[PDB]
């Protein structure tokens, strides 16, 4: 995941289909390997004793001040507008710096994000629409106007900006604990049938 060339945007990210395997728990990030260190939903080390059905390698590029906003049930500038984690999210969110990888000459303006929306996003819901919608309590009614905010914004990924506006590549450990028959487990020894 971290050895890839580049990642996609926050709304049309390139995920990897992960099923019927055991993740590499031999060499991972525990003692603050990257900048972001956040886990939500369940106990942060209850991953090997539990099995997960649908695992997706959701990777997108955000700013420095938006790496802690990806959390289930937590508001933010990109959580309720771009990507909402489901209620059964059992993984963690951890990002590293990519200022010398995703930048270019003049700035990379190919990454965009939605800032405002009419309603909050559902659990496990995504949208790639770039049209103008209702910003907040006052709708724009088509074109941008009537004292409304502009939803569709662009990232200022420039190499001469501050550290808080640097591009950060994220990896979302989308371990979903559902009632479906699970496919991905941990490196543990299961018991027999009693």
């Amino acid at each position, epitope marked *: 995941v971290f050895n890839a060339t580049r990642f996609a945007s926050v709304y049309a990210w390139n995920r990897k289909r992960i099923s019927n395997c055991v993740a590499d*728990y031999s060499v991972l990030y*525990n*003692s603050a*390997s990257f900048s972001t*260190f956040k886990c939500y939903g369940v106990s942060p080390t209850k991953l090997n004793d539990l099995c997960f059905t649908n695992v997706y390698a959701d990777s997108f590029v955000i700013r420095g001040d938006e790496v802690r906003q990806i959390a289930p049930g937590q508001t933010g500038k990109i959580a309720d507008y771009n990507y909402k984690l489901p209620d059964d999210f059992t993984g*963690c969110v951890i990002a590293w710096n990519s200022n010398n990888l995703d930048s270019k000459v003049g700035g990379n303006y190919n990454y965009l994000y939605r800032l405002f929306r009419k309603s909050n996003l559902k659990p496990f819901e995504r949208d790639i629409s770039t049209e103008i919608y209702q910003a907040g309590s006052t709708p724009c009614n088509g074109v941008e106007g009537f004292n409304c905010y502009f939803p569709l914004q662009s990232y200022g990924f420039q190499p001469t900006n501050g*550290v*808080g506006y640097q591009p950060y590549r994220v990896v979302v450990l989308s371990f979903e604990l559902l009632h479906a028959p699970a496919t991905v487990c941990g490196p543990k020894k299961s018991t027999n049938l009693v």
Partner: antibody
Amino acid sequence: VQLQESGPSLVKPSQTLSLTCSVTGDSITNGYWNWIRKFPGNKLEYMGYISYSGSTYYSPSLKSRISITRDTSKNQHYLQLNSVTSEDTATYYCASDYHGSKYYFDYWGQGTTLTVSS
Amino acid sequence: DIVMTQSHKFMSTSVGHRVSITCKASQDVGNDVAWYQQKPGQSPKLLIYWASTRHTGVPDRFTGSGSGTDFTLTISNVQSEDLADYFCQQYNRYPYTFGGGTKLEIKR
């Protein structure tokens, strides 16, 4: 390799603190060099590192007041600590990442004492 | 921000017992646990790398293991010269951000 810490010991606040750690033994072609700060009171805060290819990372303890540069032809590493204060008075050290003989090694330098006051 | 949750800053022990220093982190690595050691008045030196070997000048009593949340530094037959600063770090991914810290003392 072996590092040697250096730099001015009298830096006024709200300025730029510069340091110099020279590499002796090999040029900057392979390996990694980091910068650490040793605070009194059983504390050791990590700042960051730089690589030979140009990629660098920063610790999340400082928001936007940490920058590390280097020079390949001079075999020296630099630390640029912006917005210094009286609480940043600590002991500086320089380390180097090295692998060999099926073991990991992290060599240390000499160390210097820098005092920041107005 | 890095949140290194620890029980106590100063841990009390005795000569001949087992030192229990646990870095209660909210993640897991596997078989790559690293520890540091800094004597008072000396330079910080490497103590534990790759959770199976030791550095030059390190005795055989310094070892580290653990799984999941609790990574416990194991020191068997701790002498009076083992009063040093211990920090939690890794050597898998960059940067190598350290931990909180733990200072030892002898309970009398």
